[PDB]
Amino acid sequence: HHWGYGKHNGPEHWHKDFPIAKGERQSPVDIDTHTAKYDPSLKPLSVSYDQATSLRILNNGHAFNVEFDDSQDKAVLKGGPLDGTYRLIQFHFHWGSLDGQGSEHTVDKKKYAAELHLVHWNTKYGDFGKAVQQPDGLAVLGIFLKVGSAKPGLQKVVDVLDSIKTKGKSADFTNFDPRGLLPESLDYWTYPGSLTTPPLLECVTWIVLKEPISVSSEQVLKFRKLNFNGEGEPEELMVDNWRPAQPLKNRQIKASFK
Ligand SMILES: COc1ccc([C@H]2OC(=O)NC2=O)c(OC)c1
Ligand SMILES: [Zn+2]
């Protein structure tokens, strides 16, 4: 597969290799704040990242992934809409060429400058590859980024980016604390959806935080210096690595808050 985000291989083309692109629970979606309903049954959300062990950062040609040791329950997400225990495996971002776009989810059609995805898998399926074949296999925590004041907890990530400019490059990235990327509030919207890139599997419980985090223009500018291409290939800046909003179909978005 040669999928990407260009005119010739971007989201509008994905359905030819990945027909589930036109399925019934595709992501991202627009979150219409006037139609999402508060759900009193949602249990409290539990983000337990104190024992998180980051290992590595990888430019995969689509984004950069900060990977974690998920061989044990070190950093987990529970509660909210979730049954059981979901283990953190990696986080990454989607961002724009300009500050007015870059997020995958939208809020009343608003596009944020970027969106962080913290990806976790359901430990009852044993491994991540099995989990992505299940409707409740993954829980993705999605956090919007707006451009304003710098996020101090992001700066170790931005500073390593020069070392992984091109596709296939990785770097050691130990001791990074993902709690520094969270907003103050854990108020969220939740709905059933999918992976937002190929293979587009319909295996995700989406948990999208209402409160965005602020990053500086300098921080996001450094994201935009990455490359989709590999070393020694023609330079294509890693920008606009987001899929647009997909049809909601037969789904309800629930709010954790009133
Ligand atoms: C192999 O594991 C994957 C594959 C794709 C996605 C895409 O779905 C998403 O929401 N962002 C993505 O890059 C993923 O993240 C959950 C994890
Ligand atoms: Zn993502």
Swiss-Prot record:
What outcome is documented for mutating residue 65 to Q in this protein?
2-fold decrease in enzyme efficiency, as determined by kcat/KM ratio, and efficiently inhibited by chlorzolamide
Q: Changing residue 195 to A: what effect?
A: Reduced CO(2) hydrase activity
Could you give the subunit structure recorded for this chain?
Interacts with SLC4A4. Interaction with SLC4A7 regulates SLC4A7 transporter activity. Interacts with SLC26A6 isoform 4 (via C-terminus cytoplasmic domain).
Listed result of changing residue 5 to F: Enhanced activity
| Effect recorded for residue 117 to E | Strongly reduced activity
Effect in UniProt of substituting residue 63 to S: 2-fold decrease in enzyme efficiency, as determined by kcat/KM ratio, and efficiently inhibited by chlorzolamide
**Keywords, alphabetical:** Acetylation, Cell membrane, Cytoplasm, Disease variant, Lyase, Membrane, Metal-binding, Osteopetrosis, Phosphoprotein, Zinc
Recorded catalytic activity of this chain's protein: hydrogencarbonate + H(+) = CO2 + H2O; urea = cyanamide + H2O
Q: What is the effect of changing residue 140 to G?
A: Weakly impaired activity
**Gene that encodes the chain:** CA2
What's the disease link here? Osteopetrosis, autosomal recessive 3: A rare genetic disease characterized by abnormally dense bone, due to defective resorption of immature bone. Osteopetrosis occurs in two forms: a severe autosomal recessive form occurring in utero, infancy, or childhood, and a benign autosomal dominant form occurring in adolescence or adulthood. Recessive osteopetrosis commonly manifests in early infancy with macrocephaly, feeding difficulties, evolving blindness and deafness, bone marrow failure, severe anemia, and hepatosplenomegaly.
Named cofactor requirement(s): Zn(2+); Co(2+)
Q: Which residues bind substrate?
A: 196-197
User: What residues does the Alpha-carbonic anhydrase domain cover?
Assistant: 1-257
Could you tell me what this protein is called?
Carbonic anhydrase 2
| Gene Ontology cellular component annotations, sorted alphabetically | apical part of cell; cytoplasm; cytosol; extracellular exosome; myelin sheath; plasma membrane
Q: Which residues bind Zn(2+)?
A: 92, 94, 117
Q: What's the impact of mutating residue 196 to D/E?
A: Strongly reduced activity, but enhanced zinc affinity
* Outcome of substituting residue 92 to C/D/E/N/Q: Strongly reduced CO(2) hydrase and p-nitrophenyl acetate esterase activities, impaired stability of zinc binding
* SUPFAM superfamilies the record matches: Carbonic anhydrase (SSF51069)
Q: How is the cofactor bound?
A: Zinc. Can also use cobalt(II) with lower efficiency, but not copper(II), nickel(II) and manganese(II).
**Impact after mutating residue 60 to T:** Reduced activity
Q: Catalytic residues per the record?
A: 62
Task: Supply one GO molecular-function term.
Answer: cyanamide hydratase activity
According to its UniProt entry, this protein's organism is Homo sapiens (Human)
